[PDB]
Write a protein that binds this ligand. Structure first.
Ligand code: NAG
Ligand code: NA
Lengths: 216, 219
């Protein structure tokens, strides 16, 4: 119910990372959400290994640099019973064979929860839980070139909502409401790697596409 | 090493905004102390600038009208504590002291001043963690800075009076030993610069440094 929420301020959120030319956004979105939930549990923020996810979470349905799903990532962590740190298992921006080492695991999870495709539901989750994984439409040139301000999706379509990102908060610029959204295109994109997305729009849509978060 | 970046190592809180209050000194000091507390404990906790603004007058600080990061570090020593950002929020104006020792999350033991050589600063950055320094922030092109390498347009000791935090260095090029820069965290919020950061020209050939008033707290 609070009118603003920002989880970075609360220490839940690692610095912005860069996926490279590898279609692995699903992995950065997943690690973001798990980093948040591990922080809540332990109080220790530890950057998590996307590469671990990209290499090893095929059996759950993920396709490495060719795409994947935050939920499949959360399921891998449960099945696997851990996930290595970013430090122990660094990002290569390409799919290699699995190198999971249990001795370097710094995260578990216990399941995951899908949120309904409603901006009100997303609000309640963000206010309550921590950073939330979602997928957005990242396809448009104006989003490529984004620098500042509230970004308005020109265009509402389910199919195109397929780039994984992390909702770390919400606020208002004033009226003029926005989600605070951490991307994985490095800190030179957008507002040091962040974007404010228009929120509670009027025209009915919609970034609560495939919203979800792990349980710990 | 040829690149250092303490953010990636967990040392650095998110960019804060000092507002219209002349308190960069306090944000620079808390950034440096947040680093060294992390190095010690492995817990990263955001520290109160308001606590510094309100309470470190007796060490020589002047709240919203200026001060020095060394004075901040001295206060934390003398005080025997510093409140968390959460417990003692930033208001961008000077009020009466409200330090509560029950809410202390940081100590220090003193501080170390670094010589104004870019090489002595490089060693410290490489070896200690994020370092407090003061730069010249007065120029319009620094105000409008968005990306790339920033070149200080003159060298002038008296104008280097805006406290910031050096959190690393590296190089632009595909080369290295060319287009070197310091990574510098500002306190002008995340809409200034590159997410609140600036890459400052490093190892220049006119021998103008930025290691003006360099120091870090000991813990
Ligand atoms: C800091 O040091 C003081 C005095 O030695 C001690 O009483 C206090 O518990 C310490 N506080 C923290 C947060 O380390
Ligand atoms: Na795999």
């Amino acid at each position: 119910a609070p009118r603003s929420v920002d989880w970075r301020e609360k220490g839940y959120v690692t610095p912005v990372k860069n996926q490279g030319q590898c279609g692995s956004a699903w992995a950065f979105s997943a690690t973001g959400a798990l980093e948040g939930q591990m922080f809540r549990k332990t109080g220790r923020l530890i950057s998590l290994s996307e590469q671990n996810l990209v290499d090893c979470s095929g059996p759950q349905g993920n396709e490495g640099c060719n795409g994947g799903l935050m939920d499949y990532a959360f399921q891998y962590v449960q099945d696997n019973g851990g996930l290595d740190s970013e430090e122990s298992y660094p990002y290569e921006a390409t799919e290699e064979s699995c190198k999971y080492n249990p001795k370097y695991s710094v995260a578990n999870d216990t399941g995951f929860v899908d949120i309904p495709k409603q901006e009100k539901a997303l609000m309640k989750a963000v206010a309550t839980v921590g950073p939330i994984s979602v997928a957005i439409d990242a396809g448009h040139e104006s989003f490529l070139f984004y620098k500042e301000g509230i970004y308005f999706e020109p265009d509402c379509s389910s199919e195109d909502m397929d780039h994984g990102v992390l909702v770390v908060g919400y606020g208002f610029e004033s009226n003029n409401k926005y989600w605070l959204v951490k991307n994985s295109w490095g800190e030179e994109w957008g507002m040091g790697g962040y974007v404010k997305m228009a929120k509670d729009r009027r025209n009915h849509c919609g970034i609560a596409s495939a919203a979800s978060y792990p349980t710990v």
